[PDB]
Amino acid sequence: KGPAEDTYSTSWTNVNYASDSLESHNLDIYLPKEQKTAYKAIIIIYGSAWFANNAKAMASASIGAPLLKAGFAVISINHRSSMEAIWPAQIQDVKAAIRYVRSNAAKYNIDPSFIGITGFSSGGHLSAFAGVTNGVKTLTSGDLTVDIEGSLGNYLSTGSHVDAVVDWFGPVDMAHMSNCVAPNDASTPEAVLIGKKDPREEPDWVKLISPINFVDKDDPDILIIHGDADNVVPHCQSVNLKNVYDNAGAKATFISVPGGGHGPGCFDTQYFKDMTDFFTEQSTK
Numbered sequence: 001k002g003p004a005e006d007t008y009s010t011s012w013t014n015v016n017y018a019s020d021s022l023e024s025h026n027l028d029i030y031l032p033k034e035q036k037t038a039y040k041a042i043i044i045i046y047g048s049a050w051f052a053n054n055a056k057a058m059a060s061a062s063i064g065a066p067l068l069k070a071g072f073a074v075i076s077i078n079h080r081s082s083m084e085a086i087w088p089a090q091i092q093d094v095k096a097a098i099r100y101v102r103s104n105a106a107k108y109n110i111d112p113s114f115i116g117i118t119g120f121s122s123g124g125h126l127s128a129f130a131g132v133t134n135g136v137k138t139l140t141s142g143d144l145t146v147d148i149e150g151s152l153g154n155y156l157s158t159g160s161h162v163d164a165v166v167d168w169f170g171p172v173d174m175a176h177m178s179n180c181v182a183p184n185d186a187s188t189p190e191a192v193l194i195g196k197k198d199p200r201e202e203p204d205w206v207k208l209i210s211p212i213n214f215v216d217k218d219d220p221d222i223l224i225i226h227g228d229a230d231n232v233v234p235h236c237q238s239v240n241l242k243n244v245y246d247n248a249g250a251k252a253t254f255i256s257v258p259g260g261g262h263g264p265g266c267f268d269t270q271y272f273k274d275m276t277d278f279f280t281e282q283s284t285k
């Protein structure tokens, strides 16, 4: 459970970041084995089609070790299930976790001058969504307004911005999920996220769950990694995100994994190195 014991010198597990009693608002913190005065931080988020509220250990086991070996503190967070709270609960959870880490950095030997964020599938969606809403309190489409920043926890005065994003095959363009050209029907995970409505009938909801719509020239840099044989979230999603970053004047690096699946082929030394090199380069810029 979690990252290999020899990858970290210090661990805090099941730290609640929302000042409540919900496991969906817990996180785990790991500091690298290589001891140092303070550590730049990476927040990681599991994928689960937004359904899981307790899988932070899976994320740590999946991509925690390379980050620790690269010298970063790793914070793996839970978020609430789409089945217990609809959008924007999940991004409000992420924002609250970010505020908790930034505010409490000193207590955990964390250097708050760099906080990156990364996740796979729905965790990549949440990571990208944080990276397109630095400094953004609310978003509106038509008559619908969602509170992105939220009011969860006891660190509301702390900033919730992230400095860099790594998006592992995240669903980010739900207007173009079905056959890469249309919204999915009410049977699908994004339908649950928006309250079990039919995405094909809810253009405002679909816009407000899709971070591709809010990319701006001033966004933090992003690294996008997607397998060209992903049979769960289509490659077109990351192609589209890169095109939007390119056309918005923002900075995106897109790495396509040949033969890569929804994880398989992607979680290997080469692309872990791409992620840790990216975060390391960003940590200095």
Ligand SMILES: *S(=O)(=O)c1ccc(CCN)cc1
Pocket (backbone or CB within 6 Å): 047, 048, 049, 050, 120, 121, 122, 123, 171, 177, 184, 188, 189, 190, 232, 233
């Ligand atoms: S990812 O594994 O978290 C993921 C998988 C499947 C979906 C459904 C999109 N129609 C979303 C995210």
